[PDB]
Amino acid sequence: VKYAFKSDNLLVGKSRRDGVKASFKNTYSTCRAIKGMGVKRAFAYLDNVLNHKEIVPFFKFYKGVGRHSQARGSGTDKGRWPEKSVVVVKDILKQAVSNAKHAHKKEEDELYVISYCVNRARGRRRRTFRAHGRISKYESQPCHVELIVGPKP
Amino acid sequence: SKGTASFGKRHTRIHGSCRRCGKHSFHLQKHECASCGYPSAKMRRYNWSYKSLRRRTQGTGSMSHMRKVYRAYNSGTLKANARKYLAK
Amino acid sequence: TTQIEKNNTIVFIVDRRASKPEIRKAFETVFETKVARVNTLITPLGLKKAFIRLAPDVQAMDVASKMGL
Amino acid sequence: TANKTLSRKLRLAKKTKTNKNIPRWVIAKDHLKKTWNYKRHHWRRSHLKL
Amino acid sequence: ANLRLQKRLAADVLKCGKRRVRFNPAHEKYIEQASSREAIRSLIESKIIAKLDIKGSSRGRIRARHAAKRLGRHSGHGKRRGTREARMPSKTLWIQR
RNA sequence: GAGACCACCCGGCGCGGCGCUCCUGUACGGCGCAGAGCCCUGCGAUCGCCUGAGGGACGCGCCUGCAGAGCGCGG
RNA sequence: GAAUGGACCAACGAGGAUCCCACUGUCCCGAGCCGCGCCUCCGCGAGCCUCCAGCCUCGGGAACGGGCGAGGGCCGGCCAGC
RNA sequence: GACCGCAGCAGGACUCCGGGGUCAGCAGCCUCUAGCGCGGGAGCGAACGCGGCUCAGGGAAGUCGGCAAGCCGGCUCCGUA
RNA sequence: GCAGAGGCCCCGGGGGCGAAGGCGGCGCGCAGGCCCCGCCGGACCGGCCUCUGGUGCAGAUCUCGGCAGCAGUAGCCGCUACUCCGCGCCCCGGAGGACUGAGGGGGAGACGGGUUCCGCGGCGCCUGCAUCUGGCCGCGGGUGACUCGGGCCUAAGCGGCGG
RNA sequence: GAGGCCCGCCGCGGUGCUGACGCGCAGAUCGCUCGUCGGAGCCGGGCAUGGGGGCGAAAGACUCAUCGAACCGCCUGGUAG
RNA sequence: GGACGCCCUGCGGCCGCUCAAAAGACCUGAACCCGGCCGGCCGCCGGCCCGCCGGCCCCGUCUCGAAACACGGACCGAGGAG
């Protein structure tokens, strides 16, 4: 059982990726901001963060993240534009958008993102080298992105 | 310059492969094997290390001849022995 | 194979123990040919490789053809 | 090192030919499940004869 | 399209350093297909592969100041940064005399 | 005019021109019977004139040119 | 206090003192200006520590409390400094 | 540029060949040949740091102490207790 | 209460008509603890009597394994440096602008490493950002001597000798 | 043209800054500033000296990140009011 | 040891398939820790409909005496001593 969301006859399109090589913290925020958006609006919004026109609000992991003007509306002064995460979240959304529309024969407007669970995953552990004969670590933080488009909220 | 610089002036081969024991234990300057004991006829066995003795001894190799002759003693090597003792 | 055509040389892996003269007699007796000089390198992987330049009268291309090289 | 010894060269040579991966057909024949040699060395980290 | 292997071969053929070697950018394909000293040599005849000159520094300013120095133009006590004995050893003049 | 980020204050901005004013100190080049002298009409560090010149500007005044006020997001 | 060496200083000395001429932000008394870090972004990403919890005043207490008695303050969430 | 220090460790590794100009110089400073663009980039131009400059008038009054910085300097010629 | 041993479990104890184990919820017991239910799980497990012990853990700067907050934080500040265009990656080609500056970030050897060299293909790792790059990975190859060096001879030294 | 002469490059040392760094570039590095630089000089290879022993222009220094007695195994799961 | 079809520039995703089961790189899969969705405003003990009143210092340990500005203790699992 890999998929957290239980549809129980909700006519949804679900696409996921496992151990995507991005930061868990940055991807989590991109998915949370996307939640509730129209599928088309989400595509435009994610293109805008890549173009720096719109910011991704950092509602959870915000310490050390800079306040910007673009995040004034979202209710959090803090925000960041995560480019690598945006590519992955758009790609995962694209597979869900196609899968719901092919499987449930639903027009793109009806589909809206409804669920966003992202779980931290096991990562590589490259060693770092420090002073006084110390060997440290540069462990990665991959995540399992699961994004589900759906009929209505 | 006690550590790194001192380790950087190392480019020599104190130890070399042993003739008898094939290990990097043969001192090139002293001409003796740290583990093998070569050029001594007797081999270096010290009961201070149980583990060192276990790392190289009988049973740590093919034991070719001994195995073949031990097997024969549970077969016809003993009959050959009896024939020799009596006449030939 | 280009060497067989312009240097008259067939390159053969031979036993490491074999000396230059021994490979001269062996190549001559096994391939029924006349040899001029054998240069030998021990491959980094411990194999003696021989470069036998055949005597001018014989052509290596024919000798190679008999072997199949 | 360019001035090496045949006896030293011979022992170093075996190491070069021995540092090889498990033949894929061997993995299939014995059903290995552990396809990594673990006795494979690398010139950057491993010090042979040390 | 790494043309590095072609560049290294071209340097030995031309008998010059890789920096001097220049390639006609138009013939990218025929250089990519090149893979041998001989193939590069055919390209050298077509003039697609060429070397530049050593572009050594000019000596014109130097050979003008040297000529003016023969007229005693740039020799003065401010110009001298070394002792007379260094500039003219006294042993040298006595041995000559 | 305000600033680490933000916020603040202001907005069809700005770009680059033109005048004004200012900074430095008389632009390249051309001209001379300048020029110590040397030597052939050649050479020459320099000096005077065209020149308080030219070059520069983030301050002002103006448009003379391009432009410039999101059915972008939210209520 | 006299080869447990005494006295003695030419010449030396990254040796230890004192003063003068010179010189200077050492200072009066600080000011402006470069580069690079910092800060913000993109991509990477540890260490160390960690009973819990992290506002004060006084009192009592292993006599110097974050917690205990009595007051007096305090949405919560962060940044740059310190 | 691969050795040795746990590293793709401003760490340490012995030789050989050594151009031009300014110079007393194999010094410093630029260059020919030859190599080459190094554990990444963008912005902003806060404090504070880290290196670097300058500072009116005074000048060590600063400090445990002139620490640090500044002065001086090349060459020629006088003049040297 | 644990884990084994000897017995018993009135037609011969409980089990694929679901064992042990795990997760939540009752019930009983002063409590140590027990029991049952639902769900997962997938083959073993007990109650009483007698016997045995390597028999119950909040600590020991405990051992080992996992992993949190700090924290998207500290940091990636040596070697003057890149730019445009090509299809363009930090690779490559042209064009610029630099740099190491002949006690070289040059070209070579002794040593030490031991194939790293080369060509072709690729990126799964590694290249502490990236990569289409590479010293990385797969495959296939590569070190030719009468004159150079070893060998040779002796040096400091070291062994060997009737004993 | 003499000198265990002087200045000074590389080298060889390491004085200050009490500088940088101090979870370091680094279990000793880096920057200037230095001491020396024909000598009692420096450097590479071979060799010799071995643990209460060596070696020491002496500092109980040095003997492989250990030294007022190395390191590895063992006695040893030494003993502790 | 993964039929097919759907798409995807492609990756990969999606369905499903095989099998009793995905058991899918592996039996069971606890604690710590974390992400979604939902539900509250919250340490313990007592009374009550349940967020209000009342009471509560951090254990272990030496110690005459510890909440101590004494010491050990981030967290959890397994092992751990008459």
B19 touches chain D (CB under 8 A): no
- In this complex, does chain A touch chain D, defined as having at least 3 beta-carbon pairs under 8 Å apart? no
Q: Which two tokens stand for residue C61?
A: 């291309």
Angle between helices A39-51 and A24-34 (to 10 degrees): 140
For J1, nearest residue by CA–C1' is E91
- Max Cα separation, chain C? 34
Tell how far CA C60 is from the center of its chain.
9
DSSP B5-58: HHHHT----SEEE-TTT-SEEEETTT--BTTT-TTSSS----TT-HHHHHHSST
Q: Which residues pair with E50 in a beta bridge?
A: E22
Say how far B54 CA is from G18 C1', in Å. Answer: 78
Q: Which two tokens stand for residue E2?
A: 């790494």
Q: Which residues pair with A134 in a beta bridge?
A: A130
Q: Name, in order, each residue with C-beta under 8 angstroms of E40's C-beta and a sequence gap of 6 or more.
A: E6, E9, E10, E13, E34, E49
Closest CA to C53 of C18, C15, C4, C19: C4
Closest CA to D1 of D31, D43, D42: D43
Q: Which of residues 23-52 of A touch strand F (CB under 7 A)?
A: 37, 41, 44, 48
CA distance D3 to chain B (A): 14
Q: Is A43 annotated as a binding residue?
A: no
B24 touches chain D (CB under 8 A): yes
Q: In chain C, what residues touch D8 (CB-CB under 8 Å)?
A: none
Closest CA to D16 of D50, D41, D47: D41
DSSP B49-68: -HHHHHHSSTTSS--HHHHH
SS3 A120: strand
Q: Is E18's CB less than 7 Å from nucleic acid strand H? A: yes
For residue E82, the surrounding DSSP H or E stretch is none
Measured CA to CA, the distance from residue A116 to residue A35 in angstroms comes to 7
Chain-chain contact of C42 with D17 (C-beta, under 8 angstroms) = no
Q: Which residues pair with A67 in a beta bridge?
A: A78
CA within 13 Å, CB half, E4: 1
Angle between helices B64-73 and B77-85 (to 10 degrees): 70
The nucleotide lying nearest A153 (C-alpha to C1') is K37
Closest CA to A147 of A39, A36, A31, A26: A31
Q: Is A36's CB less than 7 Å from nucleic acid strand K? A: no
Q: Is A134's CB less than 7 Å from nucleic acid strand H? A: yes
CA distance D2 to chain B (A): 15
Measured CA to CA, the distance from residue D10 to residue D16 in angstroms comes to 10
Contact C54, C31 (CB under 8 A): no
Contact E59, E65 (CB under 8 A): no
DSSP3 helix / strand / coil % (chain A, rounded to 5): 30, 25, 40
Q: Is E63's CB less than 7 Å from nucleic acid strand H? A: no
User: Checking phi first, is residue D25 left (phi over 0); if not, alpha (psi -120 to 50) or beta?
Assistant: alpha
Q: Is A96's CB less than 7 Å from nucleic acid strand K? A: yes
Nucleotides on strand K lying under 7 Å from protein C-beta: 6-8, 10-15, 25-26, 34-37
Q: Name, in order, each residue with C-beta under 8 angstroms of E9's C-beta and a sequence gap of 6 or more.
A: E34, E36, E37, E40
Strands E49-51 and A134-139: unpaired
Q: Tell me the CA distances in angstroms from C29 to C22, C33, C34, C66, one per residue in order.
A: 11, 7, 9, 14
DSSP B3: S
Neighbors of chain B with 3 or more C-beta pairs under 8 Å: D
Chain-chain contact of D9 with C45 (C-beta, under 8 angstroms) = no
D45 touches chain C (CB under 8 A): no
D13 touches chain C (CB under 8 A): yes
Q: In chain B, what residues touch D50 (CB-CB under 8 Å)?
A: 24
**D-contacting residues in C 21-50 (Cβ below 8 Å):** 42-46
B17 touches chain D (CB under 8 A): yes
